[PDB]
Structures are given as structure tokens and as C-alpha cells.
Design a protein around this nucleic acid. Structure first.
Ligand SMILES: [Zn+2]
Lengths: 213, 135, 101
RNA sequence: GCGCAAGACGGACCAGAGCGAAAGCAUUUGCCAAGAAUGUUUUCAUUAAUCAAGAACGAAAGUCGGAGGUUCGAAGACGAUCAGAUACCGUCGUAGUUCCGACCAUAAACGAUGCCGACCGGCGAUGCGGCGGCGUUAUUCCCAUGACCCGCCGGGCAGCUUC
């Protein structure tokens, strides 16, 4: 009869200004007929894109979520929505004869975004260690978790989303948590494994053009 | 037909491959997973129930998907490999290997491959019993 | 008569150990009695790597692996030839099989 | 694919590792009372060991009322296999599985090995507390403090070897 794809317009997807590469791909949506508006159709789509496809000179085990808020004439504009690591990365990091330490915080940014951040870290074996295991005592991991919980709070509460994201691209929060925990028990693979977005402010068109330069 | 793109540029889709021990799904959608382009299973090709999980049936499914994708400008695919997950098995089915060759031999370009099987942090009781399946 | 000094387990100095389900039967097995295997495999086998890199848009792309922990009951480890039977003295050898060679 | 809700469950880290009188105990944080071991040139000064009677707790299943009911699932209804199947396999599914309050007092409740005390061979590890000692590391320093390294002492879970 008729190919249902003959009623579909293609749109390009743009990443915000924090990333070097802006074009991330294309989507499609059925055209408008009455009260069936395409622009209302493609608002709210989430794209999970590897960091290496946004920063061509970065790691490929980090992923960012981008959600569409507007459609400005064949281009749909996205905003930060979440972040997480890869299953391969996590499963490779989890090993046996060491200890895992994890934490989670809820922090609201200055500009009104509420985020839940998760952090992970693993105990490290020494160069001259003869023993098989490198476990940490229970009060040693309550100190480490306390330090993860306060560094994540201060580095999100102080600043807004645009420059919070610029701290996630190189993962500078985990690098600070690693430095500040070697006097308790040296840590090995410290990452912000996940960032989840809870609440949003009332949408403003003025502040989305800023995020696209 | 398809996007108006220069010849030297790749247009990416996403291939969800769900390989269980009873069937195999090959499911190509756009980059968001919201609009699907094509879906072919093993049961759509063969007529015997025992061959739905066959590696051969997963080959005729990915060739009929790659043919349809090479009709709308979809030139490259990101691969999301799935097992049943949950309480049940975490290992992909026999048709999992033969579906990554049928769509590669067909002429597609391969992006990034990732496992998307569902692992519970901890879950409900599994079927069977405390003595399991006695056959 | 008693066969093993450890009763076929690893339980020492505790009363109860939480059970798990066999990967093959869905049978309840104590965690210290189950036969456990960590499998790190490749997603694509050597029969498909030559057809995967020629279609890859990234130069020098490293293909991912797959990490699965498998638990067996005593019956499936024997049926699937994961674990064999062995002589009375050899039973006391608890060194892992020389696969790492 | 994006959300919403319901109940159950705390994976991977997780070990011949730890705690408890035994049943038993695993997401974060806070509160509450409890406990072993080690340290001690503190204190009392025999206050102790085992125990008829009599008591506290006691997996799972099971019984009474309230609440809720995701998953699994005795009984039951079916579809297969079979010479026959009232079974093993599969589709549903009641009581139950969960919580609150009362009963029940049983397990291959097992180390199939009562409790307290003394003596009798070695060796390497491991968990906790203490003591000593080159040297690495917390970036370049002050000391303590942590993570390694080499030993000693006490109390624990175990292992190897022995005419
Ligand atoms: Zn089994």
C-alpha cells in the first residue's frame, strides 16, 4: 500500500555547548495532521551518547544522557539529563580480594537542578605487599564514604549545571576523592559511576540558547 | 528516500539483539530507541518451533533487517546485546553470534557494542523449587 | 562412613549460610557448597572477528568482554563435566587445575 | 521508548573470613541498650565447676484474629510422556510465602563428638588487641597517625606434617 515511513520528517540532534562535537545524529518523526504535532512528538527523547563521540579526545567508557527540549527548525536542542559508566567498565573494576566502597548524595544546584550522585572506589594493593587480600576495616570505610559524600556536595551545591558538567567530562571529582583518601586507605579506581537527575526548574527558553552558545 | 546526507557521512541506528534460548529478536531503531525502523525474529523465518533459536534462523533475520535498513540511509549501527536476564540466564542465546555476522556481511558499519541484559540488584523467587528442574 | 573432612563445604565457625539458586536447575544450594566459576568471555568469537573489524568505523577499536559468575549444584558440575571424580588421595589436592599454563 | 504504582528482595565485592548461648546475622545514616578479646604495679577477696525442680530463647512447616497481597507455589483444574502416571516436564492457580498480636516446641536442631581444668611434636598462614624494628607511601618538611615490610605475646576460625 503505502510505506508508513513516507510520512516521516528527519531532524538533526544538537548537543549543548559543553562538548566539542555538536552533531550527534538524526531522528525521525511523523508529520503533523490536525492535533498531532510533530514538535510535541519529539520532545522528551533521551539520547545516551558515549563521551568519545562528544569529546573526540576523551574516554569511551563514560556515557551522557541528553533530553530534547525544543525543535528550532529541523534541529532539536538537548540538555544534560544524566550520566553513567559502562557495564564492561564496572564489571572489569569489580575484583575479589579487595573492598568496594560506595556512596550517594542528593544535591540541588544553584540554578535549580536536583541531582543524585553515586560514587564508587576500590582498595589498592601495595608494590611490596606479600599478603593476598587488601580489605579495609569498617570504620575505615565509614570515613572514606564520609569524604566521598562531602566532596560531591560541595562541588555541585556551589555551582550551576553548565560548569558542573564540565567537571564530569574529565571526572575531576573522583580525582579529588582519590587524593583525599590515601591517608585512610589508598584507593584504586575512584569514579562517579552514575549521576541521576530528579527535578527540573520551570522551563525557560532564554537559558537554553545560552547552553548552545 | 532517507535523510538528505552527503555520500561520505554515516547515519547511525541502534540494533537491539535479544537472543534467548527460544527465539532471537533483531530490532533496529533510531538513536533514541523511540521510533523503530525494523524488527525481525527467528519465528518469522522458520516454521518449526525448535529452529527459532537456531543460529541459522538468526542469520536470515539479520539479512532481512540489513536489507531494509539499507533502504532508508541507515549505514551504521550501534549494537546492544541482550539475554533474558532477571532471575533467568545471563548468557546470550545461540543465535547471538550469527546475528552479528549476517548484518556485517550485508554491508553495514559497526559502531559500539554493549551488553544491556537486565541484572537485578536482588530479585523475586525463581521458578522451579528448592529441588530445581528434575529433568 | 565419612568421606571428606570438610563435609563437602567451606563452612567453619558459623551456623547458617544463605542459599543460592543453581544456574542450570534453579535448585537451592548453600553458597559455600556450590561450585562457582567466573567466566570472562568475548562477545564475538574468533569466527566473527574478521567480519567485525572490517565493518568497524573506529580505527583500533577494542571489542568488549562479558563477565558472568556461574553457580552449580553438585549434580550439574558432574553432569556438565565441570567437575570429575578422582581417587582417594587425589581428592586431597585442592590446587586449581593447570589451565593457566 | 518515556513515566506512574505495588509488594517482595539486598546480587556482583563474599573468603575453609567475622559476630552470637544456639536457632541465626549482609544497602546508607541516626538513636538505644548490650558483648568478647586485648591493655592494666586499679578494686573485692573464694565470691567457684556441673546441675533434680523451675525457667528464657528456639529454622521450616502448622493453628487463631487484623493488614496486604509482587513473585513463587502444597491442594485443585488442565496439556504432554507412558503399557499404565493419580509422578517426574509444561500452563494456570487456592492455602501459604510478607507484616502486626497470640499459640505450637519440633529438624541429618550434625563436628552424628556435653561442660570446666592440667600435661603432651613441629611449620606456614589468617582475624582481633598490644609491643618492637631497617626501609617504601599519604608527594616533597615537624611529630604523631594511616597503607605496606620483618618479627614477638595473648585470645579466636581453621590448614599442612609426624612411628
Ligand atoms: Zn544444578
Amino acid at each position: 500500500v503505502v510505506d508508513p515511513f513516507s510520512k516521516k520528517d528527519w531532524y538533526d540532534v544538537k548537543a549543548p555547548a559543553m562538548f566539542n562535537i555538536r552533531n550527534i545524529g538524526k531522528t525521525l518523526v511523523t508529520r503533523t495532521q490536525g492535533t498531532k504535532i510533530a514538535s510535541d512528538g519529539l520532545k522528551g527523547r533521551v539520547f545516551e551518547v558515549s563521551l568519545a563521540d562528544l569529546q573526540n579526545d576523551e574516554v569511551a567508557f563514560r556515557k551522557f544522557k541528553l533530553i530534547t527540549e525544543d525543535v528550532q527548525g529541523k534541529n532539536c536542542l538537548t540538555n544534560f539529563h544524566g550520566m553513567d559508566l559502562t557495564r564492561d567498565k564496572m564489571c572489569s573494576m569489580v575484583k575479589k580480594w579487595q573492598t568496594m566502597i560506595e556512596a550517594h548524595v542528593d544535591v540541588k544546584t544553584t540554578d535549580g537542578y536536583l541531582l543524585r550522585l553515586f560514587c564508587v572506589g576500590f582498595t589498592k594493593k601495595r608494590n611490596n605487599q606479600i599478603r593476598k587480600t587488601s580489605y579495609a576495616q569498617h570504620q575505615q570505610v565509614r570515613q572514606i564514604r564520609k569524604k566521598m559524600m562531602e566532596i560531591m556536595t560541595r562541588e555541585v551545591q556551589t555551582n550551576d549545571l553548565k560548569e558542573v558538567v564540565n567537571k564530569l567530562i574529565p571526572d575531576s571529582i573522583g580525582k579529588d576523592i582519590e587524593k583525599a583518601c590515601q591517608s585512610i586507605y589508598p584507593l584504586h579506581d575512584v569514579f562517579v559511576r552514575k549521576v541521576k537527575m530528579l527535578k527540573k526548574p520551570k522551563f525557560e527558553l532564554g537559558k537554553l540558547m545560552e547552553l548552545h552558545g | 528516500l532517507g535523510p538528505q546526507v552527503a555520500e561520505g557521512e554515516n547515519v547511525f541506528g541502534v540494533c537491539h539483539i535479544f537472543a534467548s534460548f527460544n527465539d532471537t529478536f533483531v530490532h533496529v531503531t533510531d538513536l533514541s530507541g523511540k521510533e523503530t525502523i525494523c524488527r525481525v525474529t527467528g519465528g518469522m523465518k522458520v516454521k518449526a518451533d525448535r529452529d527459532e533459536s537456531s543460529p541459522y534462523a538468526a542469520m536470515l533475520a539479520a539479512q532481512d533487517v540489513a536489507q531494509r535498513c539499507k533502504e532508508l540511509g541507515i549505514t551504521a549501527l550501534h549494537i546492544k546485546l541482550r539475554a533474558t536476564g532477571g532471575n533467568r540466564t545471563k548468557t546470550p542465546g545461540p543465535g547471538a553470534q550469527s546475528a552479528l555476522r549476517a548484518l556485517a556481511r550485508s554491508g553495514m558499519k559497526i559502531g559500539r557494542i554493549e551488553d544491556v541484559t537486565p541484572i537485578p540488584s536482588d530479585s523475586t523467587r525463581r521458578k522451579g523449587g528448592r529441588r530445581g528442574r528434575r529433568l | 562412613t565419612k568421606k571428606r573432612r570438610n563435609n563437602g563445604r567451606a563452612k567453619k565457625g558459623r551456623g547458617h549460610v544463605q542459599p543460592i539458586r543453581c544456574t542450570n536447575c534453579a535448585r537451592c544450594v548453600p553458597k559455600d557448597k556450590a561450585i562457582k566459576k567466573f567466566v570472562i568471555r568475548n562477545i564475538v568469537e574468533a569466527a566473527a572477528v574478521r567480519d567485525i573489524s572490517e565493518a568497524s568505523v573506529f580505527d583500533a577499536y577494542v571489542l568488549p568482554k562479558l563477565y558472568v559468575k556461574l553457580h552449580y549444584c553438585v549434580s550439574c558440575a558432574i553432569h556438565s563435566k565441570v567437575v570429575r571424580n578422582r581417587s582417594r588421595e587425589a581428592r586431597k589436592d585442592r590446587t586449581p587445575p593447570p589451565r593457566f599454563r
